[PDB]
Coordinates of C-alpha atoms and ligand atoms in Angstrom, one line a residue:
Chain A
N1 CA 17.9 16.2 -5.9
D2 CA 18.6 13.2 -8.2
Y3 CA 19.3 9.9 -6.3
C4 CA 19.6 8.0 -9.6
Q5 CA 22.5 10.2 -10.8
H6 CA 23.9 9.8 -7.2
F7 CA 23.8 6.0 -7.5
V8 CA 25.6 6.2 -10.9
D9 CA 28.1 8.5 -9.2
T10 CA 28.8 6.7 -5.9
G11 CA 27.1 3.2 -6.0
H12 CA 24.8 4.3 -3.1
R13 CA 21.3 3.0 -4.0
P14 CA 18.5 5.7 -3.9
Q15 CA 16.6 3.6 -1.2
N16 CA 19.7 4.3 1.1
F17 CA 18.3 7.8 1.5
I18 CA 14.7 6.9 2.6
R19 CA 14.3 8.3 6.1
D20 CA 12.4 6.8 9.1
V21 CA 13.5 3.1 8.4
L22 CA -0.1 7.2 17.0
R23 CA 0.2 3.3 17.2
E24 CA -0.7 2.2 20.8
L25 CA -3.2 0.2 18.7
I26 CA -0.4 -2.0 17.5
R27 CA 0.6 -3.0 21.1
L28 CA -3.0 -4.2 21.9
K29 CA -3.2 -6.0 18.5
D30 CA 0.3 -7.7 18.1
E31 CA -0.8 -8.8 21.7
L32 CA -4.1 -10.4 20.5
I33 CA -2.2 -12.1 17.5
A34 CA 0.3 -13.4 20.1
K35 CA -2.5 -14.7 22.4
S36 CA -4.6 -16.3 19.5
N37 CA -1.5 -17.9 17.8
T38 CA -1.4 -21.7 17.6
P39 CA 1.8 -23.4 18.9
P40 CA 4.3 -23.6 16.1
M41 CA 3.9 -26.8 14.0
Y42 CA 6.4 -28.0 11.4
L43 CA 7.0 -30.9 9.0
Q44 CA 10.1 -31.9 7.1
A45 CA 8.8 -32.8 3.6
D46 CA 10.3 -33.1 0.1
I47 CA 7.5 -31.0 -1.5
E48 CA 8.3 -32.4 -5.1
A49 CA 7.8 -36.1 -3.8
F50 CA 5.1 -35.3 -1.1
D51 CA 1.3 -35.2 -1.7
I52 CA 0.2 -31.7 -0.6
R53 CA -3.3 -33.0 0.2
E54 CA -1.9 -34.6 3.4
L55 CA -1.8 -31.0 4.8
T56 CA -5.3 -30.4 6.4
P57 CA -7.3 -28.5 7.2
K58 CA -7.7 -26.0 4.3
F59 CA -5.6 -22.9 4.9
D60 CA -6.7 -19.2 5.3
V61 CA -3.2 -18.0 4.3
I62 CA -0.4 -19.6 2.3
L63 CA 3.2 -18.1 2.2
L64 CA 5.0 -19.8 -0.7
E65 CA 8.9 -19.3 -0.8
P66 CA 10.1 -21.7 -3.5
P67 CA 14.0 -21.7 -3.8
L68 CA 14.5 -19.9 -7.1
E69 CA 17.9 -20.3 -9.0
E70 CA 18.3 -16.4 -8.9
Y71 CA 18.5 -16.5 -5.0
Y72 CA 21.8 -18.6 -5.4
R73 CA 24.2 -16.7 -7.8
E74 CA 27.5 -16.2 -5.9
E75 CA 19.8 -29.2 -8.1
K76 CA 17.5 -28.4 -5.2
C77 CA 16.3 -25.1 -6.9
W78 CA 12.7 -24.9 -8.2
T79 CA 11.8 -23.7 -11.7
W80 CA 8.6 -21.9 -12.5
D81 CA 7.6 -25.2 -14.4
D82 CA 8.0 -27.0 -11.0
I83 CA 6.2 -24.3 -9.0
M84 CA 3.2 -23.9 -11.4
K85 CA 2.6 -27.7 -11.1
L86 CA 2.0 -27.5 -7.3
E87 CA -1.6 -28.3 -6.3
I88 CA -2.1 -25.2 -4.2
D89 CA -5.9 -25.0 -5.1
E90 CA -6.3 -28.4 -3.3
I91 CA -5.3 -27.0 0.1
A92 CA -6.5 -23.4 -0.1
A93 CA -9.8 -22.5 1.7
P94 CA -12.5 -21.2 -0.7
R95 CA -11.9 -17.8 0.9
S96 CA -8.1 -17.5 1.4
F97 CA -4.9 -15.6 0.6
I98 CA -1.5 -16.4 -0.9
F99 CA 1.8 -14.6 -0.6
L100 CA 4.2 -15.7 -3.3
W101 CA 7.9 -14.6 -3.3
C102 CA 8.6 -14.1 -7.1
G103 CA 12.1 -12.7 -7.1
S104 CA 12.9 -9.9 -9.6
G105 CA 13.0 -11.7 -13.0
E106 CA 10.6 -13.9 -15.0
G107 CA 8.8 -14.7 -11.7
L108 CA 7.0 -11.3 -11.8
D109 CA 5.1 -12.8 -14.9
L110 CA 5.1 -16.5 -14.1
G111 CA 4.0 -15.9 -10.5
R112 CA 0.9 -14.0 -11.7
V113 CA 0.2 -17.0 -14.0
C114 CA 0.5 -19.3 -10.9
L115 CA -1.8 -17.2 -8.8
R116 CA -4.5 -17.3 -11.5
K117 CA -3.9 -21.0 -12.2
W118 CA -4.6 -21.7 -8.5
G119 CA -7.7 -19.5 -8.6
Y120 CA -6.5 -16.3 -7.0
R121 CA -6.6 -12.6 -8.2
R122 CA -3.4 -10.6 -7.6
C123 CA -4.5 -7.9 -5.1
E124 CA -1.1 -6.4 -3.8
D125 CA 2.5 -6.3 -5.0
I126 CA 4.8 -6.1 -1.9
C127 CA 8.4 -5.0 -2.8
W128 CA 11.3 -5.9 -0.6
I129 CA 13.7 -2.9 -1.3
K130 CA 17.3 -3.7 -0.4
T131 CA 19.7 -0.9 0.8
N132 CA 23.5 -1.2 0.3
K133 CA 24.5 1.3 3.2
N134 CA 27.1 -1.2 4.6
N135 CA 28.8 -2.0 1.2
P136 CA 28.0 0.6 -1.6
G137 CA 31.2 -0.6 -3.4
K138 CA 30.1 -4.0 -4.7
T139 CA 29.1 -4.8 -8.3
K140 CA 26.5 -7.6 -8.9
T141 CA 26.8 -9.8 -12.1
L142 CA 23.7 -8.6 -14.2
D143 CA 21.1 -11.1 -15.4
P144 CA 21.4 -11.2 -19.3
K145 CA 17.9 -9.8 -20.0
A146 CA 18.3 -7.1 -17.2
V147 CA 18.3 -3.4 -18.3
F148 CA 18.9 -2.1 -14.7
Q149 CA 20.7 -3.3 -11.6
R150 CA 18.0 -5.3 -9.6
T151 CA 17.8 -4.1 -6.0
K152 CA 14.4 -5.5 -4.9
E153 CA 12.2 -8.7 -4.7
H154 CA 8.4 -8.9 -5.1
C155 CA 6.0 -10.9 -2.9
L156 CA 2.6 -11.0 -4.7
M157 CA -0.6 -11.2 -2.6
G158 CA -3.5 -13.2 -4.1
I159 CA -7.1 -13.5 -2.9
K160 CA -9.7 -16.1 -3.7
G161 CA -13.4 -15.8 -2.8
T162 CA -15.2 -12.5 -1.7
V163 CA -13.8 -9.3 0.0
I164 CA -10.7 -4.1 16.0
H165 CA -9.2 -5.2 12.5
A166 CA -8.1 -2.2 10.3
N167 CA -5.1 -1.6 7.9
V168 CA -1.8 0.4 8.8
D169 CA 0.9 -1.5 6.7
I170 CA 2.4 -0.3 3.4
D171 CA 3.4 -2.5 0.3
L172 CA 7.2 -1.9 1.0
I173 CA 9.8 -3.6 3.2
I174 CA 13.1 -1.8 3.4
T175 CA 16.1 -3.7 4.8
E176 CA 19.9 -4.0 4.1
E177 CA 20.9 -6.5 1.4
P178 CA 21.8 -9.7 3.3
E179 CA 25.3 -11.2 3.1
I180 CA 26.0 -13.4 0.0
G181 CA 24.3 -16.9 0.2
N182 CA 21.9 -15.7 2.9
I183 CA 18.5 -16.5 1.1
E184 CA 16.2 -15.5 4.1
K185 CA 13.3 -13.1 3.3
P186 CA 12.6 -10.3 5.8
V187 CA 10.6 -11.5 8.8
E188 CA 8.6 -8.2 8.2
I189 CA 6.5 -10.2 5.7
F190 CA 5.0 -12.3 8.6
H191 CA 4.1 -9.0 10.4
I192 CA 2.2 -7.7 7.3
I193 CA 0.3 -11.0 6.9
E194 CA -0.6 -11.4 10.6
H195 CA -1.8 -7.7 10.7
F196 CA -4.5 -8.5 8.0
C197 CA -6.3 -10.7 10.6
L198 CA -7.3 -13.3 7.8
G199 CA -7.7 -16.4 10.0
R200 CA -5.5 -18.7 12.0
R201 CA -4.7 -21.6 9.5
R202 CA -1.4 -20.3 8.1
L203 CA 0.9 -22.5 6.0
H204 CA 4.5 -21.6 5.1
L205 CA 5.7 -23.8 2.2
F206 CA 9.5 -24.1 1.7
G207 CA 10.1 -22.6 5.3
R208 CA 13.2 -23.7 7.3
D209 CA 14.1 -24.3 11.0
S210 CA 15.0 -20.5 11.0
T211 CA 11.4 -19.4 9.9
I212 CA 9.4 -21.6 12.4
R213 CA 7.0 -19.2 14.2
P214 CA 4.0 -19.3 16.5
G215 CA 0.7 -19.3 14.6
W216 CA 2.3 -21.0 11.5
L217 CA 2.6 -24.5 10.1
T218 CA 6.0 -24.7 8.4
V219 CA 6.6 -27.4 5.7
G220 CA 9.9 -27.8 3.9
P221 CA 12.7 -30.2 2.8
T222 CA 15.5 -28.8 5.1
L223 CA 13.6 -29.0 8.4
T224 CA 15.7 -31.1 10.9
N225 CA 12.6 -32.1 13.0
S226 CA 8.8 -32.4 12.7
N227 CA 6.0 -32.1 15.3
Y228 CA 3.1 -32.1 12.7
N229 CA 0.0 -34.2 13.5
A230 CA -3.1 -33.5 11.2
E231 CA -5.5 -34.4 14.0
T232 CA -3.8 -32.2 16.6
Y233 CA -3.5 -29.3 14.1
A234 CA -7.3 -29.6 13.2
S235 CA -8.1 -29.5 17.0
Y236 CA -6.7 -25.9 17.2
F237 CA -9.5 -24.7 14.9
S238 CA -12.4 -26.9 16.3
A239 CA -15.5 -25.2 17.7
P240 CA -15.8 -22.7 19.2
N241 CA -12.6 -21.4 17.5
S242 CA -13.4 -22.1 13.7
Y243 CA -13.9 -18.5 12.4
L244 CA -11.4 -16.5 14.7
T245 CA -9.5 -13.9 12.6
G246 CA -6.4 -14.3 14.8
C247 CA -6.7 -10.7 16.1
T248 CA -9.5 -11.2 18.8
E249 CA -9.8 -12.6 22.4
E250 CA -9.4 -16.4 22.8
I251 CA -12.9 -17.9 23.6
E252 CA -13.3 -18.7 27.3
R253 CA -13.8 -22.4 28.6
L254 CA -13.9 -24.3 32.0
Chain B
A1 CA 25.4 9.8 -28.2
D2 CA 26.3 13.6 -28.4
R3 CA 22.9 14.5 -30.1
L4 CA 20.5 16.9 -28.1
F5 CA 17.7 17.6 -30.7
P6 CA 15.2 20.1 -29.1
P7 CA 11.8 19.2 -27.6
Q8 CA 8.9 18.4 -30.0
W9 CA 5.2 17.6 -29.3
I10 CA 1.8 17.0 -30.9
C11 CA -1.5 17.8 -29.1
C12 CA -3.8 14.9 -30.1
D13 CA -6.2 12.2 -29.2
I14 CA -3.6 9.3 -29.2
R15 CA -6.4 6.9 -30.2
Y16 CA -6.6 8.8 -33.6
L17 CA -3.1 10.0 -34.5
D18 CA -1.3 8.1 -37.3
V19 CA 2.0 7.4 -35.5
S20 CA 3.5 5.8 -38.7
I21 CA 4.5 9.4 -39.6
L22 CA 6.9 9.7 -36.6
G23 CA 9.5 7.0 -37.7
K24 CA 11.3 4.7 -35.3
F25 CA 12.5 5.2 -31.7
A26 CA 15.2 3.7 -29.4
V27 CA 12.8 4.2 -26.4
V28 CA 9.0 4.4 -26.1
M29 CA 7.5 5.6 -22.8
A30 CA 3.7 5.5 -22.0
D31 CA 1.8 6.7 -18.9
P32 CA -1.8 5.7 -19.9
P33 CA -5.0 6.6 -18.1
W34 CA -5.9 3.0 -17.6
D35 CA -9.5 2.0 -17.0
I36 CA -8.9 0.9 -13.4
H37 CA -12.7 0.1 -13.0
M38 CA -13.8 3.1 -10.9
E39 CA -15.4 6.6 -11.3
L40 CA -12.4 8.9 -12.0
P41 CA -12.1 12.7 -12.6
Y42 CA -10.2 12.2 -15.9
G43 CA -11.0 10.3 -19.2
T44 CA -9.6 6.7 -19.5
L45 CA -8.9 4.5 -22.5
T46 CA -10.9 1.2 -22.6
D47 CA -8.9 -2.0 -22.5
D48 CA -9.7 -2.5 -26.3
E49 CA -8.5 1.1 -27.1
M50 CA -5.2 0.4 -25.2
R51 CA -4.8 -3.0 -27.0
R52 CA -5.4 -1.2 -30.4
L53 CA -2.7 1.5 -29.9
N54 CA -0.3 1.2 -32.9
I55 CA 2.8 0.8 -30.6
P56 CA 4.2 -1.9 -33.0
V57 CA 5.0 0.8 -35.7
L58 CA 7.1 2.9 -33.3
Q59 CA 10.2 0.6 -32.9
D60 CA 12.3 -2.1 -34.6
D61 CA 14.8 -2.6 -31.8
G62 CA 14.5 -1.1 -28.3
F63 CA 12.8 -0.5 -25.0
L64 CA 9.3 0.3 -23.8
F65 CA 8.6 1.9 -20.4
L66 CA 5.0 1.3 -19.4
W67 CA 3.6 2.8 -16.2
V68 CA 1.0 0.4 -14.6
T69 CA -1.3 0.6 -11.5
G70 CA -4.0 -1.7 -10.0
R71 CA -5.5 -4.1 -12.5
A72 CA -3.2 -2.5 -15.2
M73 CA -0.3 -4.5 -13.7
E74 CA -1.9 -7.4 -15.5
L75 CA -3.5 -5.5 -18.5
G76 CA -0.2 -3.7 -19.1
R77 CA 1.6 -7.1 -19.3
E78 CA -1.0 -8.2 -21.8
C79 CA -0.6 -5.0 -23.9
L80 CA 3.2 -5.2 -23.7
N81 CA 3.1 -8.9 -25.0
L82 CA 0.4 -8.1 -27.6
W83 CA 2.6 -5.1 -29.0
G84 CA 5.5 -7.6 -29.4
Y85 CA 7.6 -6.9 -26.3
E86 CA 9.0 -9.2 -23.6
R87 CA 9.0 -7.7 -20.0
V88 CA 12.6 -7.7 -18.8
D89 CA 12.6 -5.3 -15.9
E90 CA 10.2 -3.5 -13.5
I91 CA 11.1 -0.1 -12.1
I92 CA 9.4 1.1 -8.8
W93 CA 9.2 4.8 -7.8
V94 CA 9.0 5.3 -4.0
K95 CA 7.0 8.6 -3.7
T96 CA 8.6 10.8 -0.9
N97 CA 8.1 14.3 0.5
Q98 CA 10.9 17.0 0.6
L99 CA 12.3 15.1 3.7
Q100 CA 12.7 11.7 2.0
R101 CA 9.7 10.3 4.0
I102 CA 7.4 7.9 2.0
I103 CA 4.0 9.3 0.9
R104 CA 1.6 6.4 1.7
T105 CA -1.9 6.6 0.0
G106 CA -4.9 4.2 0.7
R107 CA -7.7 3.1 -1.8
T108 CA -10.9 1.7 -0.2
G109 CA -10.5 -1.4 -2.5
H110 CA -7.1 -2.3 -1.0
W111 CA -5.4 -4.3 1.8
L112 CA -2.2 -2.2 2.0
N113 CA -1.3 1.5 1.9
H114 CA 0.6 2.0 -1.5
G115 CA 4.1 3.5 -1.3
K116 CA 5.1 3.2 -5.0
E117 CA 4.3 3.3 -8.7
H118 CA 5.4 0.6 -11.1
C119 CA 6.9 0.9 -14.5
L120 CA 7.2 -2.2 -16.7
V121 CA 10.3 -2.4 -19.0
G122 CA 9.8 -4.2 -22.3
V123 CA 12.3 -5.1 -25.0
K124 CA 11.5 -5.7 -28.7
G125 CA 14.0 -7.0 -31.3
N126 CA 17.8 -6.9 -31.0
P127 CA 18.7 -3.6 -29.2
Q128 CA 22.5 -2.8 -29.7
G129 CA 24.6 -0.1 -28.0
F130 CA 22.4 0.5 -24.8
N131 CA 24.2 0.9 -21.4
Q132 CA 22.4 -1.7 -19.3
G133 CA 23.0 -1.8 -15.6
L134 CA 24.1 1.9 -15.0
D135 CA 21.0 2.7 -13.0
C136 CA 19.1 0.5 -10.5
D137 CA 15.4 -0.4 -10.6
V138 CA 14.3 1.8 -7.6
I139 CA 13.6 5.6 -7.9
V140 CA 13.3 7.6 -4.7
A141 CA 11.8 11.0 -5.7
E142 CA 9.3 13.7 -4.7
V143 CA 5.7 14.0 -6.0
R144 CA 5.3 17.1 -8.3
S145 CA 2.1 19.0 -9.3
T146 CA 3.1 19.5 -13.0
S147 CA 3.9 15.8 -13.8
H148 CA 2.4 12.4 -13.0
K149 CA 5.9 10.8 -12.8
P150 CA 9.4 11.8 -11.6
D151 CA 11.9 13.5 -14.0
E152 CA 14.5 11.0 -12.8
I153 CA 13.0 8.5 -15.4
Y154 CA 14.3 10.8 -18.2
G155 CA 17.9 10.7 -16.8
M156 CA 17.8 6.8 -16.4
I157 CA 16.6 6.6 -20.1
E158 CA 19.2 9.0 -21.4
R159 CA 22.0 7.1 -19.6
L160 CA 20.6 3.9 -21.0
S161 CA 20.4 5.3 -24.6
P162 CA 22.2 8.6 -25.0
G163 CA 21.4 10.8 -28.0
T164 CA 18.8 8.4 -29.5
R165 CA 15.3 9.6 -30.6
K166 CA 12.5 8.8 -28.0
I167 CA 8.7 9.0 -27.9
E168 CA 6.4 9.6 -24.9
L169 CA 2.6 8.8 -24.9
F170 CA 0.2 10.6 -22.5
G171 CA 2.8 13.2 -21.5
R172 CA 2.1 16.6 -20.0
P173 CA 3.7 19.9 -21.1
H174 CA 6.3 19.8 -18.2
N175 CA 7.4 16.4 -19.8
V176 CA 8.7 17.8 -23.2
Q177 CA 12.5 17.1 -23.3
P178 CA 15.4 17.2 -25.8
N179 CA 15.5 14.0 -28.0
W180 CA 11.8 13.3 -27.1
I181 CA 8.6 13.8 -29.1
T182 CA 5.7 14.1 -26.6
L183 CA 2.1 13.1 -27.4
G184 CA -0.9 14.0 -25.3
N185 CA -4.2 15.9 -25.4
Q186 CA -3.2 18.6 -22.8
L187 CA -0.3 19.8 -24.9
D188 CA -0.4 23.2 -26.7
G189 CA -0.8 22.7 -30.5
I190 CA 2.0 21.0 -32.5
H191 CA 5.8 21.7 -32.4
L192 CA 8.0 19.7 -35.0
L193 CA 11.6 20.4 -36.1
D194 CA 12.9 17.0 -37.4
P195 CA 12.7 17.6 -41.2
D196 CA 11.9 13.8 -41.9
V197 CA 8.9 14.1 -39.4
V198 CA 7.8 17.6 -40.6
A199 CA 7.7 16.3 -44.3
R200 CA 5.8 13.1 -43.4
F201 CA 3.4 15.1 -41.1
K202 CA 2.7 17.7 -43.9
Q203 CA 2.2 14.9 -46.4
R204 CA -0.3 12.9 -44.0
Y205 CA -2.1 15.9 -42.4
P206 CA -1.8 18.7 -45.1
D207 CA -4.7 20.7 -43.4
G208 CA -3.0 20.2 -40.0
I209 CA -6.2 18.5 -38.4
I210 CA -6.1 15.1 -36.6
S211 CA -9.8 13.8 -36.7
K212 CA -11.3 10.4 -35.9
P213 CA -10.1 8.2 -38.8
Ligands
LIG1 C1 -1.8 13.9 -19.3 C2 -3.1 13.1 -19.5 N1 -3.3 12.7 -20.8 C3 -4.4 12.1 -21.3 C4 -4.1 12.0 -22.7 C5 -5.0 11.4 -23.7 C6 -4.5 11.3 -25.0 N2 -5.3 10.8 -26.0 C7 -6.5 10.3 -25.6 C8 -6.9 10.4 -24.3 N3 -8.2 9.9 -24.0 C9 -8.7 10.0 -22.6 C10 -10.2 9.6 -22.8 C11 -10.2 8.8 -24.1 C12 -9.1 9.4 -25.0 N4 -6.2 10.9 -23.4 N5 -2.9 12.6 -22.9 N6 -2.4 13.0 -21.8 N7 -3.1 12.0 -18.5 C13 -2.0 11.1 -18.5 C14 -2.0 10.1 -17.5 C15 -3.0 9.9 -16.6 N8 -3.0 9.0 -15.7 C16 -3.9 9.0 -14.5 C17 -3.2 9.5 -13.3 C18 -2.0 8.7 -13.0 C19 -1.1 8.5 -14.2 N9 0.0 7.5 -13.9 C20 0.9 7.9 -12.8 C21 2.1 7.0 -12.8 C22 3.2 7.4 -13.7 C23 3.4 7.4 -12.2 C24 -1.8 8.1 -15.4 C25 -4.1 10.8 -16.7 C26 -4.2 11.9 -17.6 O1 -5.1 12.6 -17.7
CA2 CA1 12.9 -29.9 -7.6
CA3 CA1 -4.7 -11.4 -11.4
CA4 CA1 24.9 -3.1 -23.7

């Protein structure tokens, strides 16, 4: 019956009790994504100092993972003041998508302000629901405004412009709560984004060595190495490859 | 905290009821039929009708639980702020079957199947003596035919604020509960026991009719 009472009784989060956590489609499709993917490209850049307009061409998808103070609670952290001042509209394609990790506090409001500031409309709210199966007997220090124990983070999806390539994913990711000081987001967010087949120019801002991935440009201050060349990157999307969704056959040459 | 005052309700158009007669509540919950910009089988309130709801008269110090879907994730935030609340939490209800498997629904407007319903939590004033942090912000519960929302929310609210008077807007008959007054247009007449409220109701509505004012 009541998983809320059960959490109060035992410290086992209700999400611990979700089960199952047809599709020979997904083989053929994860396959086409893998074949259409650009080689991974990455650039160490202090994004507060760096002029974002140096990142060309204009992106189909932007994943934005600013390091919020709330991720570290056990200098280099970004406030919503800092984030809202990023010139995201200057690098987004006129038809494009954003995925913004907003945390579980004031970001759920300030991230929506950011999306609309950059010219997007919030179209999905993806919740990362965290289980505590391995350690139900731990007690987090509550944020002062919090009414409830916070057990999830939100990734807001934004769209700008107008609305073999369907839709099977759900607006939930369920994983175990990471060890203390592990600030990684579930790699499942990349799976959801790639499955939308939105185009091949994909930017991950505030990514890390650990998040570098085929089909993505990763930009962040902690990257140890760079391979980014604007001209090389642009050449991946040159004719005849300009309008590929990232879920179709690579176009044949000689 | 001991108090368990029996269920009370008022069948009304919530646009027209004078909620000043009901006094003050530790917790407000609303589950509005938001205008989500599509042909629906039920009546919706316009954005302006939602904005104009006299929520500010219901509380001095306490919490607001506001269910939101689709474009109402943004309109509900506007209403919450307009009514004098700060959003301080957001509950999600993961809808399951009897076997704790997620029920995943798809709109033709949408990029993703939806596994959850959102509830904004607002605070007004200086609430004292609430039990913050007993429950967590994820409900896992079965879809029922008699209610739009899971009964688990009433337990979370009771643990948060035991024995305090509470008010629900856009409630169904299954939703009537001890310590709650339920408002909605599918309820069966009027049922009032709080002498303070019965007086003020008689005095405001002596011919027991709640017409367009
Ligand atoms: C019970 C019913 N309902 C409607 C009213 C009501 C009261 N006063 C006025 C009114 N009007 C509707 C037309 C204009 C005036 N409607 N009172 N109770 N109701 C409540 C919610 C609702 N919705 C739409 C379906 C999903 C619900 N939210 C589900 C979320 C909580 C998990 C909200 C539809 C509905 O008919
Ligand atoms: Ca900084
Ligand atoms: Ca929006
Ligand atoms: Ca307290």
